[PDB]
């Protein structure tokens, strides 16, 4: 994995020694070359995971998250170079350094062979994200949002540190490859109940769980666009990745410890979709949609069937691409009307027809239109939760109805109807904006052709 860590570190002298008009182009070009190179991780096998060294490995779960992570950096550089155009050159290089450094932390977060290295990288991903939100966020609430983002994650993760060091003292190792063969059953006791909570609540905060999601519609809203892209596309999926690793160790106690959290997520996907029906902020509507989509991934990890893991990793990749594109569409209107109020700019299909086509396709992937991998992940989670209990089909179907409702309500509100008369700075769509939309959508549609590379370790 060192052949990806070293070029990501070499993006730092590439962004600090570049000419002052070349610091976006060079980082975009070489991060696209790293994203091209990311496809060598598809050397996967049906029995063995691609095990590089004592420190790094990549199974078929970490590999799509890695390719999505290394693909997200040039798109964040494209999205964030217009509103940081008038920035100081040094602060612009600091923003690009925080993006590169967050990618550097993530690509060795997902490949961490040993779990405390995963914890160090996992909590290292707070610091560039916190700096991006609280420094290049736009409104006043970015400082409070950075507080909530920091102090939910550390409140969840500092019991996780004690849990992992306890496993290190008991099993003798936190290597995940050794713990695939030295895993012992975790019986019913109060000690093992709080063991389960300490191993799971950090990732429940990072997904986010319903009831603990209150960091998210302030951190995802008050960030800039690159912060919103990385938070929606990768940093929620760190939680699901950690769950799919750490639920190896939590059996059979998960089979009754999962019930309150399965209730919280099965009811939170209804409640947050209902919240999306009544949002005035478009960016907050996309934030609560992200909570609504990650609730299904939480249920799919907690029921731990193979169909549920396949649907959960497919839905994680699909939601990363879809939510990143929805935030970029929201930014493309915010850079014209300078307001996140959804009812302000109306009738935009009369003005921006191809951008409205991108709105249509992202709203169709948001409502899980087949054969998109959105529908593949959605559908496999619904199959596995039906096999779990036959009455969960009511909640899954009601969630799908409300999901279609807020997706097409977002589309109709922003794009349809009579246009707003007093708004006259609606520029045509720039080539940068349409290129950003297509670089989100076209991989998301091409992955419907060959979807087996995003279905996890147990496809």
């Amino acid at each position: 994995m060192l052949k990806y860590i070293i070029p990501t570190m070499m993006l730092m002298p590439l962004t600090w020694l570049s000419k002052n008009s070349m610091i976006w182009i060079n980082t975009t070009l070489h991060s696209l070359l790293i994203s091209l190179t990311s496809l060598l991780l598809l050397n996967q096998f049906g029995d063995n995971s691609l095990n590089f060294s004592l420190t790094f490995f990549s199974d078929s779960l970490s590999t799509p998250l890695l390719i999505l992570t290394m693909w997200l950096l040039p798109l964040m550089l494209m999205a964030s170079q217009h509103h940081l155009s008038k920035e100081n050159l040094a602060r612009k290089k600091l923003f690009i350094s925080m993006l590169i450094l967050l990618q550097l932390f993530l690509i060795m977060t997902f490949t961490a062979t040993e779990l405390i290295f995963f914890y160090i990288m996992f909590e290292a991903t707070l610091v560039p994200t916190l700096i991006i939100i609280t420094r290049w966020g736009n409104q006043t609430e970015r400082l409070n949002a950075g507080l909530y983002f920091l102090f939910y994650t550390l409140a969840g993760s500092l019991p996780l540190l004690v849990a992992l060091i306890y496993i290190q003292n008991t099993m003798g190792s936190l290597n995940f490859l050794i713990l695939q063969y030295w895993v012992q059953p975790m019986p019913n006791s109060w000690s093992n109940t709080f063991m389960w909570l300490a191993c799971m609540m950090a990732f429940m905060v990072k997904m986010p769980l319903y009831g603990l999601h209150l960091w998210l519609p302030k951190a995802h809203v008050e960030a800039p666009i690159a912060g919103s892209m990385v938070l929606a596309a990768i940093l929620l999926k760190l939680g699901g990745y950690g769950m799919m690793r750490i639920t190896l160790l939590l059996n059979p106690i998960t089979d009754f410890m999962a019930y309150p959290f399965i209730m919280l997520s099965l009811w939170g996907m209804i409640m947050t979709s209902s919240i999306c029906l009544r949002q005035t902020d478009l960016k907050s509507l996309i934030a609560y949609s992200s909570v609504s989509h990650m609730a299904l991934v939480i249920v799919a990890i907690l029921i731990q069937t193979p169909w549920s893991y396949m649907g959960a990793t497919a839905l994680m990749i699909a939601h990363g691409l879809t939510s990143s594109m929805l935030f970029c569409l929201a930014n493309s209107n915010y850079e014209r009307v300078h307001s996140r109020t959804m009812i302000l700019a109306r009738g935009l299909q009369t003005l921006l027809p191809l951008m409205a086509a991108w709105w249509l396709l992202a709203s169709l992937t948001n409502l899980a239109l087949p054969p998109s991998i959105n529908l593949i992940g959605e559908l496999f989670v619904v199959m596995s939760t039906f096999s779990w209990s036959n009455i969960t089909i009511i909640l899954m179907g009601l969630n799908m109805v409300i999901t279609a409702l807020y997706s097409l309500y977002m589309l109709i509100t922003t794009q349809r109807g009579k246009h707003t008369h007093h708004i006259n700075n609606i520029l045509p769509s720039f080539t940068r904006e349409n290129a950003l939309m297509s670089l989100h959508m076209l991989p998301l549609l091409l992955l419907s052709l060959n979807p087996k590379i995003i279905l996890g370790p147990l496809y």
């Binding site: 004592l54 420190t55 062979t113 040993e114 405390i116 290295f117 290190q168 936190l174």
Partner: protein, 57 residues
């Protein structure tokens, strides 16, 4: 016929011929505890280094 000692003589350390045995344990000390073992052997490198969680040296 007695001669008075000179200045310096009655503070000399003299030797005494006795017939009683030397006291072999005058403090009545019991048996001392056996010491801890010494360290011995050649000093090999640490097996796989520090073994601190993931540090491979």
């Amino acid at each position: 016929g007695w001669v008075r000692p000179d200045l310096g003589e009655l503070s000399k350390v003299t030797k005494v011929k006795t017939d009683r045995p030397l006291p072999e344990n005058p403090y009545h000390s019991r048996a001392r505890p056996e010491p801890n073992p010494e360290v011995e052997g050649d000093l090999k490198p640490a097996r796989h280094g520090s073994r601190l969680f993931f540090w491979t040296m």
